[PDB]
Structure formats: C-alpha cells, structure tokens
Design a protein around this ligand. Structure first.
Ligand SMILES: [Fe+3]
Ligand SMILES: [Fe+3]
Ligand SMILES: [Fe+3]
Ligand SMILES: [Fe+3]
Lengths: 225, 564, 225, 564
C-alpha cells in the first residue's frame, strides 16, 4: 500500500465523518467536531468520484449542514472549513466559507461597551493631499510607511508628505490604481520621527534641518520630478 | 480617523469595557483597561505594522523581544486587560504596548519589536498562564500529551508507573526510585516535581528522599496516615522547606479528623480531595477546609456536582481500591451532602485549588474544563457574585483561574518562576480562542517557545486543513526541550548539585517558601470558616448555615466540543 | 476538529466495536477483545444519545453478551469492564460487573489442593476482649495495627491489648460502628514486637519493662480514661 | 483606636494629603499615597514593633530583607508617596509595607522583616535616589567627598588630574591613560565612568579608547570640535553603543551652530553647558536645546540667575581659559539674555539635566542645591505650574529631581542599574531631613550599605554631639567598597574581560542603550521648541515668544545652612 503519514491522518478524518453520518441518521444534532468531519468526508467522497471541480464543491458546501441539523452555536464556531483531497489532477485544497448555517447562539461572543466609533490617531493634525498613480500598475501604501518615500510612480507634493504617514487603521493599506487620483489624509509620524530605511531618502529624524537634504535626495533618486 | 466599533474589534480584538463570553458558559470577562494608543496597534502581515523601519525598529536595543504576542486579552488574577505581551530569553519581558519608539507613540520602553522579534497574533484571543496540576499520579507517560492538550504545563505528584503503590498514591519512594524518575523526566515537555513517601515515624528515611530531589512528601493512608507519621513528616518538611500533601485516615483507625488536625499543629499542609470521595476521614474530612493552615484542593470527579456524580463513584471507588462485590450504602448518604457543599465552597473561596487525581480517581485532561464548568454551574444557580462591580463576572473568573494557576504555584513553592502572567516570570502561557476557552486551547508556549498546539494536515498547503488535532511542536523536541522544561527539586538537592550528579540536561530549579504559606497567602480564595458536618444527615454547615448546591443535568464546555 | 490524544484512542475502541458488531451479525462467537469492544461501543452510543443515566447503563450492561454469543471462557476472562464516555453532564465512568455471561470453561483457573480451611496465625494465644465504639463515627482497625493504640473513641481494657493485634486475615480490617459493641480476638504481635509509630504510645519493644510507661502515656493522651 | 493627627505625624511621618516644605524653599511636596495599614506601621526601639515574633518574623523566608527603611517619604519621578523600602543583596528588593505576615495585615509579600534585617528609621525623612553628575572633570580626588556630601553617588566625565587638558576638558585620552584612571578609581566610593578624546578625524584612535574601557567620548573645542571630528566621533559611538558629550566651536571657526547640528545628523549627543557661558558657538548655542536628538544639560554657575552671575563670569572665564588682561564687552551683552532664558527653559522642561563642570567653570558639591534654588526661583517668579493638580508642586518637583537622577542615567546608558527609587535597581539612595532637603543630606547608601553620613564626636556617648560633620562609613572602606562601587565601561571592554585584564576588584558594569535616546525618552523634560537668538539684542525666543527671567537677589538653601 505504501501509506504516507498524511494518508493515515485522512483515514481518521474519514472514519470520524462516517461516525458523524451514523449519528445524523439516528436524528442527533451534530456538535463542532462531528459537523466538520461530516462535511470533510463529503468533500473527500466527491473528489474521489472526480466529476466535480474545486469551484463546484466550494459553492455546494455552503450551509451543507443546516442550523437545525447541528447543536446551537456550531455554525458560528466554524465560519470556514478547509480540506485537502486528491482529484484526478492531483491534491487540491477545498475551502468552504460558512459550511454550517449559523443561529442566534454564539460561544465566545463579544458584547461592545458602546456602538460609538473609535477615534484613531486622536489629536494629530490632518494634511489633505492629492495623489495620482501615474504608473502602469496599481499599488498600495501601508499605515506606517513614510509617505514621502512611496513608489516614484505616485505623483504628489512630496514636501507636504515629509515626516508623515496615512491616517488609516494600523495594518491597513490604501490602494491607488493605475491612473487613479485620490485625496489622502496624512498625519505626522509618532515617537521621535526617526525614519530609518524604506527608500533611504531620510535615514534620521524628520526635522526641518534634515528636510532640504531629504528633498534633494528624493529629486536625485527620481521621487520628485 | 473614525473607525466603526465592529471593524476595530474584528481587526484588533476587544477594547476597554467590552465583554467576552468564556466558551459556551454564562461567564462574562470585561476588558478592565487597554494598554494601546488607538492608531498605533501592532498588526502582522503584508503591508501591515510590524515592518522594517515602521512597527519593527531599525535601531538596535538591549530590550529587543524574541517574541511579541500582539493585542492579547490577558485573563489572570492580576487582571482582565488588553495588552501586547513581550517574551525575551524565555521569560515574560514586558506587558504593555510593544513597537518602535522611532515611529510610534506610547511604546513601553522595554518592549522593543525589532529584527530579532517573532510575531504571534493575539488579536481576539485570550492569553492565560499555563495550568499547574498538583495531584498527578505518575502512572503513564501518555498523561503528558492529554495534560498539555488541556492547558496544563506543570505537574506535581509522584509515581514509578503502573504499580499498585502509584495506582493508589502520588509517591516516588526512596532514593533509587526518585533518581530513576528524575532521569525519566528528561523525555517530556511537562514541568515536573516529585513527592516521596511521607508515611514514616523515622527521620533518616524522610531526609534521604528530600536529599534525593523530592519537592515534598505525600502522606497517604495506604502506607498509614497515623498522627505519628503526620508529625514526623511535617517536622522534616519544616527543616527542608518542602511541601506536604495529605490523604487522611478514612477509617478513623488512629483517630478522628480533629486528631489529625492536632497532629499537624498549625503547620502548612496541602489537603488533596478535601471533599472526601477521593479519600479521607468519613464523614468529616471536609471540615478541615475551614482551617487557616490547611491549603485545600479538589479532584476533578466531584466537580461539578452532576446527576451522575454519585452513581459513578459508588463503583469507581471499587475499581481503584479493588473492593469485594459483597460490599453494596454508607457512601450513598455521606456523599451527596459533601459533593454538593464542595461546589459552593469553591464559589465562596473556601477551596483554593483544583487538581486531577489522574488515573487514580480523577481525569488528567479535565482540571481546566471542570473548574469552568463549576464556575458556570454556580453562576447559573446562585447568580452573579455580590463581589462583582459592573455587568461582568471578573471577580468570579479571577477566583476560579487562581485555582489551577497561581494558588497551586504558591502551595508548592514555585510562584516566583511560574503560575501567572507577570513580568519576570517564565513564559509558560496558553493561547485560547474565546469560543473554546477552558475546553480546547490553540497554542501552548513553554519557556518562550511553542511546545504543543492544534495542527492540521502535515502535507497541506496551509496549517488549517482537516484533520486538526493536537501535536508536539519544536520546543518539545531535541535539546530545545531541555531549554523549555523544568524539573523542580528541593533546595538541599539543588544546592548539592543534583543536576550534575544525575546528569539532568533540563532546567533544574529549587522549590522555596512552602512552610509559611497559609490561606491568607492565596489569591481570591482566602476564606476561612467554621465547617461542620451533621453525623446523622451528612449535611455540611458553614458557620451554622447549610452549605449545599443542586446537581447539574448538563454542563458547559462538554457536549458541543467532544466527539466521544 | 482539535482532536485530543484521548479522542484518537476512542475512535480505535469505537471502530473495534463496529468490527465486533459486524462479526456478531455474521454469527461468529466473539473473542475477548471483540466482546469488550462490542460492549464499549454500546456504552459510547447510549452516552451520546444522552437519555440514560450512568446508573441505568451499569445495570443494563450486566450479561450484555450471553455465553453462546461469545467463545468459551470469555465471560470468566472479563469479570468487569470500564468505559469513560461523554454524557450531557460531562465525561463519566461506566463500570459494568459481569458484562459477559460466564460459561464453565476457565482459562487460568486455580484448582485447590484441599477444600480444608487455612489456619492463619497458628499457635498464637487468643485474647478475647469486649470493645465499644463510644464515638459518634464508625471506625475500622487493620490486622497489623497495635490494638492498644486504636482511636480513643474505642472503650476496652487497654492493658489486655498491649503488644497485641487482631487475629484476622492479613490486610483485612474490623469495623466497630458508632455505639456498637463487639468481642475481638487479639493475638501477640510477631517478630521482636518493636512497635514504632502509630500513636507513639509505645515506640519500642512491647515487654513488661515498657508496659507501665506505655499505660501512663495512654492515660495522659486520653486513650485510657 | 483614634490617634491625634499631630501625634501620628510625629511618630510615623506624613500621610496621604499632607504637604512637606522642601528645605527653606517655597516648594511643597504632597504625599500622593501611603502604602501602610494604620496600626501596623513599623517602629524600631525598646518595646516597639520590630521585635522577635512580632514585627520581626520567626518564620524563615527567601525574601528576608537585609535592610528596612521604615516609613520613608519617597520623592522620585515615579511619584511622591509614603512607603517602607526593603533592601536585599544591595538592590531595592521591594517598596510597600514591610513586616511579619504571621502577626500583621497588608504586608507586601517580598518585604519580610526577619532575623537578618537591619533597621533604619525613615519616619519623617525624605528618601531620594543618589544623584548622577555627568560633567565631572577628574581633576582632584578631593571632589569625591564634596560630591557625596551633596547627595551625588555617580560621576561621569574625564581627566588625568591637574593638567591643562583635564583643567579644560572631561577627557581621559588614549589607552594608557584610560587604564591608569580605571585602576585609580578602585580607591573611591563614587561610581565612575570615563570619556575619551572624541576630537579625531580617524577611526582607529577612537576605537582603541572604547576598547580601553571608555563609556563614551567628549568632543571639546580645545582639541578642535570641527564638523569632521563631530561625524567621525558619532560614527564610532553608534558602532560601539557609547555616549558623546559636546563643547561646541565657540569662535565659529569651521562653521555656525547649524553647521554643527548638520554634522550630528540627528544622532544622539549630550550637549554640556547648553546656555553657552561654559562654552559653545557664540551667541546661538542655546538654539540646540529645541532639537529632538539633542540631550541638553546645564552647569551650576549660571543656575539660578543671580545679581552676581554676570559679574562673576566676566573674570571666572579668564582664570579657567587663561586670557590676557588686555581683554576687557561681548559677554556683557550676550550673557544676560541666555543666562535668564536658561532658568525658564529648565522650568519648561526644555533643559533636561543639571551638571557641575567641577573645578573647570563649575562647582562639585552644588548640582543638587542649585537645581532646587532654580526650582524655587521660578516658582517665586512665575508661580505654581499650570500642570499642577491640587495645592502642591509635585509636577515641578518631579521635573527638577529628574534633572540630576533619572535623565543623566538615561543619557549615559545606566538607567537599568541606577537613577531612580525602583524595585530591582541598585540601592544607591540618600536620606534627607526635610528642613535640610536639597542642601545637607543625612545618610548616603550605596549598594545597600551606608558609605557616607553626617557624624558627630568619635569619642562621644551618642552619635549626635558636636562637631557634626561628613565622614566616610564602612561601605566606603576595605573590600566592602568593591562591593558597593561600580566602574562603568563600554560593552566591548566589559565583554572582553576589562575587569580581569586590569585587575579591577570593583563592580564592573557595561553602559548600554545610548544611541537611541532622544528628548522623548526623558522623564518630565521632553519639551522641544523652535529656539532662536536675536543676533543684535541676544534675547532668546521660544516659538517666537521672548524667553527670559529676572535675576535673584537672594537664593534658598544657602545663607541659613553654610558658615562660609
Ligand atoms: Fe488520594
Ligand atoms: Fe490521589
Ligand atoms: Fe566645556
Ligand atoms: Fe567642562
């Protein structure tokens, strides 16, 4: 047989699916592991039959188990499911979003203090700036990237972006499509404003003293046209 | 900029004032404080915060963290708050706001995210200390994966393996057996500490055991828990700063409960299965829990009190102790009264610890679920604690978490190293998804490394595909396990080079400050009272008021999560 | 699924139960491991249905398999069975005594040399003594415990119990209920009679020389009233 | 029981809400919190608290303090509060409530008063951290007793002795001179750190000095503070994590102030005598103080600004620099503007540190008095700070204490060891009587031992009889001075066994985290502004508003306390 360690895993998953099937046939509402194994075994079966595409299965398995076919809170506990199976074209990953239909019960439920919005970067002075991606390809810029050092494809008043970053949620990026024009909101960088790296236009404190040197380096390197 | 509350919570997890449901229980944890600066939160990923010269510093710093647990919701006796956790040199380096002071506001000075920092996203996760199971019968090495899979990182107790002595008692008796077990311990990821035979009316035999590496002694009735034994054992423990654990004289052969208490003479002692179904003076052993010097714990089978608790015991006692089928009952009248009271005593902070009694009248991977099932049961029966401030169960949560984290650590003299989420302590932490809190952990960190975690298909394109099951990680393997695991010993053994002498490669640390730990020393479970048992009705009384609870027909953190 | 190592064990036990069920359906007499797995799977099934109590199952499973449903000697080989299962109130231990009905075949049978009784503690002089448990709680006393040092609740002529133990089988205990009066049979302790420990009333050889000292300590500590 | 407020304060010192006048100044310190339990306060003496089995424990504990400072009023950037201070192993073990948990309520767990604990009555006393003087010219070993007698425990700077180079600059130049001085340091009670010659346009010569043990470099105009020198020096300092101190080009020979600032290139640098009378670009060196990367200090002669400050300088400059009597003035028009502004800049938190310039245009035993004289002067002129909350000067006090304690420690990379009254730090503390605060200390503790104190007649029946004068204590003598004193070195030197190689018996510790300390890193003195000087009027401007102060006709902590 030459059973690989991954094949040995799949036997257990498949057997768990078979036990879950038996319990559903008995009329029992399936729990979290039973529900996952029941859907996993279906995917593994269809893959072996090699008549359905990954695309077909991803669609077919949404709400494969209905809210009344599982215990309360099971649907919300499993927002997505992933199962690798061998298809005629090889092993492919079947990714299902909402495999089990949710209900009103939620384990690990978060109840907010207030529905009021969170004021991020509070008290920082906003700078409105028009930017144009004159490049042939779209690009994104992160929340903490030194805006002044962004891809030379971006056309904007760089002097006004010196020592500033995007006033967007931490970890988010702003997209500027090829040819697209946008109004960005910039705020001054926190801490000491010791900008080291990126495009190396600054590599030091973003003070007035470093500004002329930084603008000259930006012009020389093609960021300022 | 103004961010929608739902979007903030999805991205970074809950903030100040938000309430989190613990698993499928009716317990609500409220975020007491958030240590972040809104807009400066760390996020890992493509185009995110933790990047060269942005959230990640380019400036060298002596406090560059080895690991950062971003946007964690800490649940500990120290508080229920939101913070970034910084690990360095396998210890909790800092708790607060991590990042780069060069580009960010409000960064905790000793929480530098740099080139050498690894990232772990804790946004929307609950971070707790690793559990300490102070009632382990070292019967089977297979208990260790089961324990880790249930958030337990440290195990105190004793054994030799599947032999009658161990099967019954947490005892690794004598020098040779202690040396053998301490050397066997090298294999595992679990932190260990061994107890020797305390059942002796002779000094020499007790001293030999402490010097052999024992972290204390277990006095167990199977070797005769007589008043002479109790006194001799405590005398040696006092001399050597080690803990004593006790399973009292069930049959009241040499005396009643008061005779045992008298023999102890106000000296520090850890009272296992205080309720008495697991063993001890019938029917009044529970009365010991009211005493200041008595450090009491509970074993998993009697917590919570369910409709099947009594039925299960009236047979489970016969398989463990190997009793005649001629024996039918006494336990049928005695047991309901004390099992019920025990749950309320936990809620009152009278019983300070929860333990397992693993494969010897108790379950290895049940300490954590059963503690939260009891917390939930009481909340459901008695309602929100009067002690609570606001629409939350923070006080109850803190009372219950202390039972399996800090309080066992205080009892065994390891509170300076482990037991809680505090700066300076060893990084033995557990990451939980709130929907699975108390039932199924995500990641187990020991000594700053991931040692055990839930993991999907080994071949798979991502770590999520089925079957997702618990597996050993890098920190549990090779010579890295010697860097992440601790073998606790007595100060005498430690100071006399037990590590070198036994050729132990694991971290060897001494247990210290066992002798002067009273009820007053515990966290959220310092309650002392006059506990009495009616010798006719078997009802339990706390300062003259009937102490009881109703049996549960169903429990939380059970049926929704398990296949079998 | 987050399968714990204990859940992985239970799948094997359950599958073994399913194979055993198939073999019984084929009309095959089940062997020792098949019989255990067949009963175990039934218990695991009933627990999941969550309609039966542990008490109900313990009773239901006595002679669950009949002597003709198993191979000879199987019942005798399995005098008791234990299986932990998750019930709606959590994991509980189902303990069954005589799960498989025995037949007259016995593997590992012990055949006695004689049916005549074994004279334990032969040649030792018996001392009959009246004891009363004046205490509010019942107590037991072991075969090798120094009777003289028993719980002060017991009322008896302690002088007569000095250097003696119960003439009962080794390992057995004698029960004296709260208020109960019994006639005990005491025999002198074996070997040197070097009694060290228990209540520390003696801590030395139980000779005539130590007796007065021992009786005074017993009186002083409240054993002798 | 009800105790009269006056009687409580006499017995235990001030409690929450009480205000203490600092010396004869108009500065009032308010007790923010008291860590005691009323009725459980520790008192030492016959029939008092600290006695066997009472306030002093009979129960052995791993945290038994070596020393207890009972009922201390801590004045530190960390807060102005009332607490017991516990010393163990020459470090601040704990701050809170000390005593015996066996007999007392509310005892801080790691603050055990036991058999091995010494007692020091702090009731009614102010306890502060030992001062750090970061501008020492190692000219005379006689500066050390003068410094200690004024609450200074650590001294950074340089020298060889009474030679022209040292007389002018804080520089111990080259390997041989550095080794000689580090070996000379063994003699003293004072913590030391030496700076080498930073005035080099060649790498090798700078590297040799760091490897020889230097904690940094001093760039001084006497050896030419050219832009080439500034760049080369900072480059090596950045490589070796050491601090750079600067005395700028007074005569603007190679460039103006902006040319110097440009050469620095936003790199961390300690700017000595920022006002400019002590030296630096005339008339605009003060303009550097507005910059984020510039860590500025003041020297004692210009603080506070008095009616004799200008007159004293127009001659003190001629004795130090050895100038012709043909030179009359320029300093008469330039100096009033910057000397006046300097005092206000201190009050605004623009100038972060105060230093001495000892026997080289500044006084050794004047750092502490002069800081408080300036604090008092400003309070008297500008009134209570707007930043203050309540009828107190707590914020101003915290701003000023940081100038000679924490801020010099942060600058020089020793903040992890010394600088403040915090758990884990070395026990370098000063005990003050409130009537003599800032002018005359009572006891100087270094590494948990008393090293220097005010002491009366050596023959006398008690320690109080006259003449009471400052004397060296046991911690300053024998081999105990090696246990209480630190010689700070670079990491390179430390890691390469400088201690062993030079046969230094003193505690040798490395300076770390110097390169990334900006203005934002300081405590209560993080102010950045656009500082400008009118080149015609010599008036100083902070963001366009005239920055000035009036000269004092009399100062606090002076005439009432000194004979000469
Ligand atoms: Fe036990
Ligand atoms: Fe046990
Ligand atoms: Fe100078
Ligand atoms: Fe100088």
């Amino acid at each position: 047989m030459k059973l690989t360690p991954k094949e040995q895993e799949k036997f257990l998953l498949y057997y768990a699916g078979e036990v879950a099937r038996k319990r559903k046939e008995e009329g029992l509402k399936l729990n979290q592991p039973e529900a996952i194994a029941y859907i996993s075994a279906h995917i593994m079966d269809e893959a072996r039959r090699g008549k359905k595409t990954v695309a077909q299965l991803m669609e077919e398995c949404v709400h494969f188990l209905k809210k009344d076919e599982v215990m309360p809170g099971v649907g919300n506990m499993v927002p997505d499911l992933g199962v690798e199976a061998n298809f005629p074209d090889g092993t492919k990953l079947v990714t299902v979003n909402w495999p089990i239909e949710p209900d009103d019960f939620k384990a690990g439920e978060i109840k907010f203090a207030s529905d009021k919005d969170i004021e991020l970067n509070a008290g920082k002075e906003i700078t409105e700036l028009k930017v144009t991606n004159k490049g042939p390809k779209s690009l994104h810029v992160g929340s903490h990237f030194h805006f002044f050092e962004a891809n030379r494809a971006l056309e904007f008043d760089r002097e006004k972006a010196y020592g500033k970053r995007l006033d967007i949620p931490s970890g988010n990026t702003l997209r500027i499509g090829a040819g697209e024009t946008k109004t960005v909101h910039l705020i001054p960088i926190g801490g000491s404003k010791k900008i080291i790296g990126m495009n190396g236009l600054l590599n030091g404190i973003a003070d007035d003293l470093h500004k002329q040197k930084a603008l000259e380096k930006a012009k020389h390197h093609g960021f300022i046209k | 900029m103004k961010m929608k509350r739902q979007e903030y919570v999805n991205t970074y997890g809950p903030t100040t004032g938000d309430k989190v449901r613990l698993g499928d229980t009716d317990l609500w944890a409220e975020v007491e404080h958030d240590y972040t600066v809104y807009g400066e939160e760390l996020k890992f990923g493509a185009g995110k915060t933790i990047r060269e010269g942005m959230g990640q510093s380019n400036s060298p710093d002596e406090n560059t963290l080895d690991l950062v647990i971003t946007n964690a919701l800490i649940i500990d006796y120290t508080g229920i708050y939101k913070a970034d956790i910084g690990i360095k040199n396998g210890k909790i380096h800092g708790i607060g706001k991590a990042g780069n002071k060069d580009m960010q506001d409000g960064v905790t000075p000793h929480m530098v995210v740099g080139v050498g920092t690894e990232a772990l996203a804790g946004e929307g996760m609950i971070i707790t200390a690793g559990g300490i199971d102070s009632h382990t019968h070292f019967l089977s090495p297979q208990q260790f994966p089961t324990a880790l899979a249930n958030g337990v990182t440290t195990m105190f107790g004793g054994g030799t393996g599947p032999v009658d002595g161990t099967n019954a008692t947490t005892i690794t008796p004598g020098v040779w057996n202690l040396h053998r077990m301490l050397r066997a311990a090298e294999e595992y990821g679990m932190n260990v500490g061994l107890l020797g035979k305390g059942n002796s009316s002779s000094r020499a035999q007790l001293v030999e055991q402490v010097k052999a590496g024992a972290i204390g002694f277990k006095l167990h009735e199977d070797w005769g828990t007589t008043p002479s034994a109790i006194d001799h054992c405590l005398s040696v423990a006092d001399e050597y700063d080690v803990q004593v654990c006790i399973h009292t004289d069930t049959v009241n052969e040499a005396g009643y409960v008061d005779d045992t208490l008298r023999a102890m003479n106000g000296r520090a002692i850890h009272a296992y299965h205080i309720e008495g179904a697991g063993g001890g003076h019938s029917p009044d052993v529970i009365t010991m829990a009211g005493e200041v010097n008595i450090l009491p714990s509970s074993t998993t089978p009697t917590i919570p009190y369910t409709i099947n608790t009594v039925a299960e015991h009236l047979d489970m006692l016969m398989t463990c102790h190997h009793l005649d089928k001629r024996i039918r009952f006494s336990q049928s009248r005695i047991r309901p009264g004390s099992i019920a009271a025990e749950d309320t005593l936990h809620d009152m902070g009278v019983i300070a610890m929860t333990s397992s009694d693993s494969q010897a009248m108790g379950r290895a991977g049940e300490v954590i679920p059963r503690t939260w099932q009891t917390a939930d049961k009481n909340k459901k029966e008695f309602g929100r604690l009067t002690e609570e401030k606001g629409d939350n169960d923070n006080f109850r949560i803190k009372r219950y978490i202390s039972k399996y984290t800090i309080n066992p650590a205080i009892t065994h003299g390891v509170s300076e190293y482990i037991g809680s989420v505090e700066e300076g302590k060893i990084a033995d932490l557990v990451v939980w998804n709130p929907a699975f809190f108390g039932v199924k952990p995500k990641i187990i960190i020991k000594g700053g490394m991931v040692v055990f975690s839930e993991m999907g298909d080994s071949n798979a394109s991502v770590p999520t595909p089925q079957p997702v099951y618990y597996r050993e990680m890098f920190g549990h393997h090779g010579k890295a396990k010697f860097d992440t695991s601790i073998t606790f010993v007595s100060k005498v053994a430690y100071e006399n080079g037990i590590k070198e002498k036994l050729g132990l490669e694991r971290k060897v640390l001494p247990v210290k400050n066992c002798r002067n730990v009273t009820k007053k020393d515990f966290k959220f479970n310092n309650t002392t009272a006059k506990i009495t048992v009616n010798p006719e009705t078997f009802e339990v009384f706390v300062n003259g008021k009937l102490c009881t609870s109703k049996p549960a027909t169903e429990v939380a953190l059970a049926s929704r999560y398990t296949f079998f």
